[PDB]
Symmetry: C5
Subunit: 277 residues, 5 copies
């Protein structure tokens, strides 16, 4: 016999330099208030009369979700040569409520005739998330520059046919929840140095949606220089859009269906040369 090591499991608090935050963001499909009958869906998609006359109704346009998480205060003021900042190092993220689509009794269009189940949510899907130290920077680009956007969303200013491609004047920040339409704004790849974003799109009229869920997967947020998003003003920005498809009603009107997203982000305190003038 001899003295030797044995590993005992116990509750461990990590070091003071590490923190984790959790949040969820509910979808902003157009009915964005929990009291609304169609919360989590858009209103019925109204289609253009013509190219020139294309005026989506209020609440028919899915928008990005964003939350700003206030992190623990690190500095007394911004006067020193170096400051402390939170660096986001990894994220675990999940789309919540996927199983809710496994439902063929909800009223709608029938799969076959009136004795069958109803058609589930299907068609175009769009799933993206971002984690950054400032708002996600957006680029405007639309299917049609002659669409008239509702007052209650943020559209491209002074739209022209050039906005059917990439016009460098069409820029915005994702700084408001449920206001920036998915069909108008995409992540700006010429910026976003301090954000990590990931997106998947599948189109088609009636395409089957595909989604995974697990609590086993972590995404590392460090860039090619080994540095994660640095949280300006001790704020963490979480952004997403999770359009599962459209639901079709018996009359063939259609509404977009979105799902919430969960985030768990790990951050560490870093010494940073002070960027604030």
């Amino acid at each position: 016999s001899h003295m030797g090591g044995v590993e005992v499991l116990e509750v461990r608090t990590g070091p003071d330099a590490i923190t984790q935050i959790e949040a969820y963001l509910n979808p902003r499909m157009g009915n964005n208030i929990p009291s609304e009958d169609l919360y989590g869906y858009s209103n019925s998609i109204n289609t253009a009369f013509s190219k020139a006359s294309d005026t989506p109704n209020k609440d028919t346009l899915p928008c990005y979700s964003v939350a700003v998480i206030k992190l623990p205060l690190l500095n007394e003021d911004m006067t020193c040569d170096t400051i402390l900042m939170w660096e986001a190092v990894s994220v675990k993220t999940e789309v919540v409520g996927i199983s809710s689509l496994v439902n063929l009794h909800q009223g709608g269009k029938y799969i076959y005739g009136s004795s069958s189940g109803c058609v589930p949510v299907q068609g175009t899907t769009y799933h993206m998330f971002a984690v950054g130290g400032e708002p996600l920077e957006l680029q405007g680009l639309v299917a049609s520059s002659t669409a008239t956007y509702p007052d209650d969303v943020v559209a491209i200013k002074n739209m022209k046919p050039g906005n059917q491609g990439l016009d460098p004047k069409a820029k915005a920040l994702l700084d408001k929840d449920g206001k920036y339409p998915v069909e108008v704004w995409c992540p700006d790849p010429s910026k976003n140095e301090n954000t990590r974003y990931y997106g998947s799109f599948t189109g088609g009229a009636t395409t089957p949606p595909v989604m995974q869920f697990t609590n086993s997967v972590t995404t590392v947020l460090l860039d090619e220089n080994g540095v994660g998003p640095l949280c300006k003003g001790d704020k963490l920005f979480l952004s997403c859009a999770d359009i599962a498809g459209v639901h079709t009603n018996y009359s063939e009107t259609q509404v977009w269906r979105g799902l919430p997203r969960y985030f768990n982000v790990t951050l560490r305190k870093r010494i940073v040369k002070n960027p604030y003038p």
Copy 2:
């Protein structure tokens, strides 16, 4: 000539500190008793008259399966500073009966006309499993808050339109086999620190199902800190749902079809600082 080693194969007992458990869980599609004619399927899916009037018939809603496996007793009592616990380290799992779908003579809707084979099981699929040291923690989220759920399932209490998104009040434990509907409950990603879960969904009205099977794949259950699920009260929780799709009858009525899942979990004895007060 020299003395040297040769490796002889033999029946080896594992260390006393390691055990394996095997179990299977039969599906709970609605007909949940083996004596029922439609065991392994739901009853015919009855669709809503309207948003306001949507009352799924008894036994038409697939539910999660759960089994609690009692493991060998490790402690005389719970009074010491440390205790022994079983830690789940890996799982091999398989969906059983996949080949039963390779059947075009079962009565149903014809692929072409009356001389052809019948349409096989297809449409929405949902496959998930979990292995944990306590019940899987669930989040409620539904397609429609105005559905009336049957008495024999566990539904969200005081359901409101907010339940079409994520409401943090809508929480449950998967603590009853064949009682928690798939379309109401999903894993809660904000909890489940002591469970590992994995899920895959594909929707669509008539989508071909895709399934693999092999006895060559092991999934490691250790988390990011190298710790597997720790079995509270010497109990192992195995959870799953395996909806293969729907079978369509000649009359075009439709029933969900589920399949059983097999689990083989390897566990090891660990010394753990006593969690019980």
Copy 3:
């Protein structure tokens, strides 16, 4: 200049290692090469009702199995140890994939009478196993009220429980072309001495997808680094390769199967005598 090595290629293997090659022809229902429809089932006859569902003989695709006798290792079976063949790897391929690339075979038309004919499509099921004893099977059916014909092995005393997993419904894959695919699947609770791999895609008319290469080897070693051990010096090769169904002009349908090739490497091992 100096003495040094150069690698010369030549024909070469040790007596402790052997390779076996085999092919298994499909057993779709027409299982004898003299049959007109060899490699296909007979026309799929569908159920009148749940209660009345009587598949005609040879309309049910079955698993293939071959038992390969390996070189005899022990003249004496009474020592502390015996020798056994351990299967360590397999190369396997579905043969005849290119035969589906045929739009002139008579059948249902893709468009009208001027177009090509619909190729084999619909449900596919591809699996293989390599083991040192019969593949162990679990019975599970779509409908317990089907009446299976007397030329196939089906579940004994079938009941509604057999639409799920009933632990009494067990069998060994020990007869070529007699165990229906739709009745039997690998039993994951056993098969410690077999490795199996399977892929299924359903749907009424789904396009089949298959690859073929001679570049891929599958290692058969389990989590303890041990391959299947061939009891009585016998190697068991099992498979099913259903490519889809062929549709005739009258809309009757037949299952189409393809052969599978195996190349298994084995090594002699010393094993403690049971």
Copy 4:
């Protein structure tokens, strides 16, 4: 004790390394930003016959190309060695993917007149290239009897041989919006100093699939560890990104393209003088 601590700060990369960024707008046929259908083709007009197939002006998607002038490296060009920029890696993204998530744009209805409109779908073609000279093209067409419009670069003296690979049908991607996608592909027999990557999915009505992230870098070094070398200090960026077709209510169809962003990292290298 004295020890290290890692402080984060802005670092300017070595003088030997530079990054450039650029975007290239799609050239689907309406290639001028003032045009109503900018980012789309004009309505696809189909052949009357094999012999009479004359696509209208601006109905043919063409490749995009941009030449990026890098910092001048060499005062004297008669020296034994020279400096050149070597492209080592690229980050690239298709911009405006989310613009397709739009079911109110006027067109064909998914179901009836109460439903959303069919989104962009059908054939897709996504490719990019990063090189130190123009992308070298091979001509190959579906039909040698098509008459191409004056405003595009077609195969010279086109003959039925051009429905396969004729080594006389070669070009350089040296003009933006002039080389039709359906006439020209990358020439795999050349392009030693370019890296190209392409993905095609066909079909009449196929759902488009596209990913977007800022987390992915592609390494441009070849099997000898060498990236594209920028001749005359010019970097060539090429692409085509056809998202599918939009279908109008009258059933006329137009190609839809999307822009592509490039971020390329380059390093100065000593190169023996050609």
Copy 5:
């Protein structure tokens, strides 16, 4: 300061032990000669009257392509203990002309009605290539043993229903360009020890084709014992078939469409015990 190395880039010729060859193989769908109007396509697919009466017209059957490339001569003396052989160690290969399918104006069946684009090439696809030191060895297997094959293709001798499965007598060598039908012959996995082959099939009546192209990808040809194909008689065999799908005419007649394949093969000289 000090003496040190700097890596200068220059044109380097490989060592004499290594060579690279490039080749392209044009498709052999039935119209196999460049002067033919439908070069790169089959003739219209004529369907069987019945199982017993199934007679595909000449040049309606896509066939494998093959090229035999003569490598540098290695042995003037074939009687020593050893000989030199070229060993194929890697290949870069690409399907050419993928972009030609991105064409909705070619005459044919309409996607919707007469105002829409025309249906592009779709349906069954079959893409394979092989690199070997001798002809690809083939196994015969057909959908129907009662088909009558034309005299301008090599088919199974004395065909019987057994040929709807694997009959070991049904064997051939891919030794003629454009004469061995894809629907009759597949690689023989029981042979081909001196060839590497790779193939992908997707069936279905109207399936969208999927193809990739890049010059960044190399496939290693070394087998499980670390040995690539050895080129007998200093000949390299390149084989392929690349059926992209079918084109449908307005009358609904259908033709197979094939595409060319490019090969770039790297080989090294090896000492080999003289057979």
